[PDB]
């Protein structure tokens with residue numbers, strides 16, 4: 001039962017180190033673009049487990065829950081960081097400070113331009129809302145905790161997991177409410193802003209689902225990194 | 229610029245007629261279960277366009293936006309009504325008053341039991357939150373208006389569509405906030421409840437995505453019904 005400022009301060013401190021990758025500097029189509037992307041993701045996934053372990057309450061979940069949450073929201077988590085990095089750069093996807101792809105460079109891979117457009121539009125919604133860093137922190141932690149687990153346990157086991165996850169999501173909501181109240185907008189505007197940010201969660205989920213199907217059409221040590 | 233009570237009163241009045249279908253009364257596996265399901269959905273989709281046209285602001289959207297919203301959220305809309313119908317019936321999916329399938333009867337179709345479990349768990353979250361009818365109305369209207377449109381227009385055209393849709397989603401948020409405030413819970417609990425309901429939107433999106441892929445692995449008159 002800690003405060004919203006504690007929780008947001010732990011989130012800021014848990015932020016992974018920005019992963020530096022460089023363009024291959026020798027333009028490629030499907031081959032090198034994805035190759036660099038795959039190396040970037042893999043570095044980011046190593047830091048994602050370290051960050052997940054610092055989200056308040058996450059390590060008090062069973063390891064079975066921890067593993068399932070991460071297995072279903074890793075791409076959403078990757079995507080929302082890409083969106084935040086690209087927010088102040090209309091038309092480009094800043095995958096890393098030295099790996100900035102423009103919208104039309106997505107024509108090189110197998111139908112990734114419509115996925116890149118989804119990502120740019122979600123990024124524009126964030127820019128339009130003027131998403132603040134602290135709001136972004138709550139939203140990313142909420143993507144991990146509101147993840148769908150699969151496969152499913154019995155209805156009774158699932159309910160126990162849900163109760164717990166719901167208690168942790170409520171602490172993050174309290175912190176986001178608190179972050180929103182510091183802007184001094186009215187009560188009505190504070191609910192609308194809470195709602196605007198939460199509704200983009202369904203868009204991040206949708207893009208992730210597409211991205212995963214898209215990666216899979218072109219193509220287990222979690223615990224080891226988790227218990228360390 | 230009408231009131232939240234106006235908007236919720238229009239939602240209640242726009243509710244489609246409950247579609248009655250009966251079990252074939254002669255048990256079948258993959259054949260008849262899906263056959264009945266397909267007829268049920270098709271009747272419901274006819275009423276879904278009539279209901280969409282009554283959501284405040286929907287008909288003031290261009291027909292291109294209207295068509296894209298409905299093309300991407302129809303399964304979510306179907307699913308959330310099924311969830312609401314099944315809410316007070318643990319273990320069963322009430323697809324229609326005379327078409328009540330128990331959890332284990334999903335073993336008859338091609339891997340639909342895990343999809344049926346997703347639906348039952350989302351339904352249990354709703355039951356656990358004690359979802360009220362008026363809250364449900366706002367949530368279903370929000371699924372239609374927060375739908376992803378595809379394919380995407382230019383970044384500029386999309387922004388114009390987003391602004392408009394955002395204005396309509398804010399009117400629905402205002403109405404849900406108002407519905408929530410009538411329970412008399414505290415301010416803190418009201419935000420948490422707003423957030424609990426909005427976070428299940430991402431779960432409805434996810435299940436829809438699965439359901440669509442699942443239907444498609446086993447297997448254009450919108451405007452005509454829209455302009456009438």
Ligand SMILES: O=C(c1ccc(OCCN2CCCCC2)cc1)c1c(-c2ccc(O)cc2)sc2cc(O)ccc12
Pocket residue numbers: 034037038040041042044045078079081082095112115116210211212214215
């Ligand atoms: O390009 C990638 C990407 C590429 C390969 C990936 O996975 C590598 C495989 N790896 C195998 C072992 C288990 C972990 C995943 C993941 C993301 C990224 C994205 C993407 C875009 C469109 C699409 O259709 C699919 C994905 S989004 C993104 C954000 C990042 O910060 C990093 C990479 C990315």
Ligand SMILES: O=C(c1ccc(OCCN2CCCCC2)cc1)c1c(-c2ccc(O)cc2)sc2cc(O)ccc12
Pocket residue numbers: 262265266268269270272273306307309310323340343344438439440442443
């Ligand atoms: O079984 C269906 C269902 C069956 C056929 C459907 O589509 C019929 C095809 N029709 C073709 C013309 C365009 C409109 C769709 C739709 C839903 C329903 C669902 C489902 C469940 C699991 C799964 O993997 C996929 C779908 S959920 C649902 C809720 C309803 O109220 C009615 C049917 C349903």
